[PDB]
């Protein structure tokens, strides 16, 4: 067993099997995590992270879609490889899900505008995305001061998952009805990278209609090998 294999079998698999939610702290370590943050901010400064209106209407996310091989996206690429490796090692142990592919990385800036995101389900209408992964980059973050707490309400288990958006934290959860969630108002700028993994059969059905998500949120790219 390699380090990502050990993490999957001893931790991620039983977490996803039972709670459908998994949190991994110090996922990349301080050094590479630092390098990922550096690149995201460099993307932000280059004007590479790009609509307001769709009770709450006004958004504010500045996003870019990163494949991983672009100039100054190497560390982001390395993050994706590490997340991929972890998902690879879960194959056949998460149930019926065949995960062949995923979205590109959604590198995102979430400014402290004092607004949260209302209770939502990532994939309400069978668009093919089965697993959401969010990698957070916020150092010195205190929720009681800066807000921005994620709360997931899993349908299987009578609990609240209160997830602080902490630097070098990987969050993994089912994208469908099982995990409705809301992000509380925040009062400082945040960065996070999100990938969604596709279920082969569900995304095939979705494409057979056209119930796939719009834009890059519905564009498939293969999962990395070792
Ligand atoms: N850091 C940070 C940070 C803030 C907000 C969101 C965000 C926005 C919109 C929908 C949604 N669902 C789950 N997280 N999330 C993700 C990461
Ligand atoms: Fe969400």
From Swiss-Prot:
Example of a GO biological process term: regulation of cell growth
GO MF annotation terms: 2-oxoglutarate-dependent dioxygenase activity; ferrous iron binding; hypoxia-inducible factor-proline dioxygenase activity; L-ascorbic acid binding; oxygen sensor activity; peptidyl-proline 4-dioxygenase activity
Keywords: Dioxygenase, Iron, Metal-binding, Nucleus, Oxidoreductase, Phosphoprotein, Ubl conjugation, Vitamin C
Protein name per the record: Prolyl hydroxylase EGLN2
Tissue: Expressed in adult and fetal heart, brain, liver, lung, skeletal muscle, and kidney. Also expressed in testis and placenta. Highest levels in adult brain, placenta, lung, kidney, and testis. Expressed in hormone responsive tissues, including normal and cancerous mammary, ovarian and prostate epithelium.
Binding site for Fe cation: 120, 122, 181
GO CC aspect terms: cytoplasm; nucleoplasm; nucleus
Effect of residue 181 to A: Eliminates hydroxylase activity
UniProt subcellular location: Nucleus
The protein's role, per its UniProt record: Prolyl hydroxylase that mediates hydroxylation of proline residues in target proteins, such as ATF4, IKBKB, CEP192 and HIF1A. Target proteins are preferentially recognized via a LXXLAP motif. Cellular oxygen sensor that catalyzes, under normoxic conditions, the post-translational formation of 4-hydroxyproline in hypoxia-inducible factor (HIF) alpha proteins. Hydroxylates a specific proline found in each of the oxygen-dependent degradation (ODD) domains (N-terminal, NODD, and C-terminal, CODD) of HIF1A. Also hydroxylates HIF2A. Has a preference for the CODD site for both HIF1A and HIF2A.
CC cofactor note: Binds 1 Fe(2+) ion per subunit.
Organism annotation: Homo sapiens
Species classification: Eukaryota, Metazoa, Chordata, Craniata, Vertebrata
Free-text comment about domains: The Beta(2)beta(3) 'finger-like' loop domain is important for substrate (HIFs' CODD/NODD) selectivity.
Subunit and interaction comment: Interacts (preferably isoform p40) with SIAH2; the interaction targets both SIAH2 isoforms for proteasomal degradation in vitro. Interacts with LIMD1, WTIP and AJUBA.
Known cofactor(s): Fe(2+); L-ascorbate
